[PDB]
Amino acid sequence: ANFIEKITYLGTPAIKAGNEHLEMIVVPEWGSNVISLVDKTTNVQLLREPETAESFHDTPTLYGIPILFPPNRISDGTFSFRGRTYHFDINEKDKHNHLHGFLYHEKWNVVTTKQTDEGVIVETEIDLSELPHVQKQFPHHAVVRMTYTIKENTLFKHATVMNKGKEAFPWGIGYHTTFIFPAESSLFSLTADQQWELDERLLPTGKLMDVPYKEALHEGMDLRHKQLDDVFLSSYQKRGGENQAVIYHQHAHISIIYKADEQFKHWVVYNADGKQGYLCPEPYTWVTNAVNLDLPSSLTGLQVLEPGEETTAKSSITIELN
């Protein structure tokens, strides 16, 4: 059994949807942010939610599940692709970067909903050709559709990227998913053995380095005293196995299993100073500043859509009670 219900969230139209195990709220006007995810049996909120509307507009990438298209930093907001030079807005001034892409603060449309025995589906979409200021930066007819499906104890979260225009473009996507993470009593694991060396502008130097605590990181580890803003390489490309971040809440015995498909080659883990009571394990299809790295696509994860092409990148959050 499952439901959809129109609601108001902090003064903005939103869509609540779910079944007997999980309930989400997505806010289309807010970059199609999944702002709430609730485990029904334990009645626990999994995502960091904003206190007010204004606090969300203050930091719209630090609540819920923000959409990063493209994710993370582009040095100087500048890169070239097949001979052509692009300039994106430099919104991170101290480090002189473009940061976090075009979509986390724009209005998406609800294009459909569907309910059956196979779960409940909410689809949102945004056509970048309809955003004049985005066009000035990225003159391509990219369209992004999100397909959210709740089925049993999993939220599936699929992004379909389309080239409806006349020229090819490169693209990547990531999520700034912000989970509640009480430092004293939660554990975190990640499928990664290596991480990208970063400079003082948080841009990759191009080198990889071993994660020295990789065994604890695989198994599940506390993050007391650790401050993370780290670009990890998924171990999947090299070792196979799983591609996922796990959060374990020790009191209610909840495992949050955040899986991502093979396109998601990198995970940024960010917890600010570690005293903020949250954790963002952010799966990305491409590495920070991928557009500016002369390395193979199997490593950076850079992807290209030719005119008329589409790609679906898949990820999912499963709530296990144990």
Composition of the chain by helix, strand, coil, percent to 5: 10, 50, 40
Q: Who's near 81: CB < 8 A, 6+ residues apart?
A: 168, 169, 170, 291
- Whether 153 contacts 322, CB under 8 Å: no
CB atoms under 10 Å from CB of 93, counted, come to: 8
Give catalytic status of residue 225 as yes or no.
no
Instruction: Give the span between the Cα atoms of 157 and 24, in whole angstroms.
Output: 11
Technique that determined the structure: X-ray
Both tokens of 184, joined, read 């004293």
Beta bridge partners of 121: 114, 149
Is residue 246 within 8 A of residue 316, CB to CB? The reply is no
All domains of the chain, ordered by start, with CATH?
Answer: 1-322 (2.70.98.10)
Structure tokens at 41: 């049996």
What does the block give as tokens for 322?
């144990």
Q: Could you give the C-alpha distances from 124 to 4, 72, 147, 230, in angstroms and in order? A: 14, 22, 7, 30
Select which of 23, 49, 106, 282 is catalytic. 282
**CA-closest candidate to residue 290, choices 102, 141, 80, 89:** 80
| Strand 169-171 versus strand 303-305 pairing type | antiparallel
> In whole angstroms, what is the distance from residue 288 CA to residue 70 CA?
9
Q: List the structure tokens of 308.
A: 């008329």
Which residues on adjacent β-strands are paired with residue 78? 87
Which residues make Cβ contacts (< 8 Å) with residue 198, sequence separation at least 6? 204, 205, 230, 231, 288
Give me the DSSP letters along 223-261: -TT---EEEEEESHHHH-S--EEEEEETTTTEEEEEEE-
> Two tokens at 264?
């998601």
DSSP sequence for 17-66: EEESSEEEEEETTTTTEEEEEEETTTTEE-B---SSHHHHHHSTTSSS--
Residue 206 CB-half CA count within 13 A:
6
The HSE-up count of residue 259 (CA atoms within 13 Å, CB side) is 13
Task: Choose among 44, 28, 35, 89: nearest CA to 63.
Answer: 35
239 is in an annotated binding site: no
Helix (H) or strand (E) holding 187: strand 186-190
73 is in an annotated binding site: yes
Neighbours of 84 (CB within 10 A): 10
Task: Give the Cβ contact number of residue 221 at 10 Å.
Answer: 15
Task: Give the whole-angstrom CA distance, residue 112 versus residue 125.
Answer: 9
Contact indicator for 126, 32 with CB cutoff of 8 Å: yes
Q: Catalytic: which of 98, 140, 176, 249?
A: 176
Closest by Cα among 76, 67, 78 to 291: 78
Element (H, E) at 99: strand 97-99
Any known ligand binding at 145? no
Nearest to 283 by CA among 143, 176, 132, 161: 176
User: What is the spatial distance between Cα 14 and Cα 259, in angstroms, rounded to a whole number?
Assistant: 25
Half-sphere exposure of 189 (CA within 13 A, CB side): 18
Half-sphere exposure of 52 (CA within 13 A, CB side): 3
Active-site annotation holds for 282 = yes
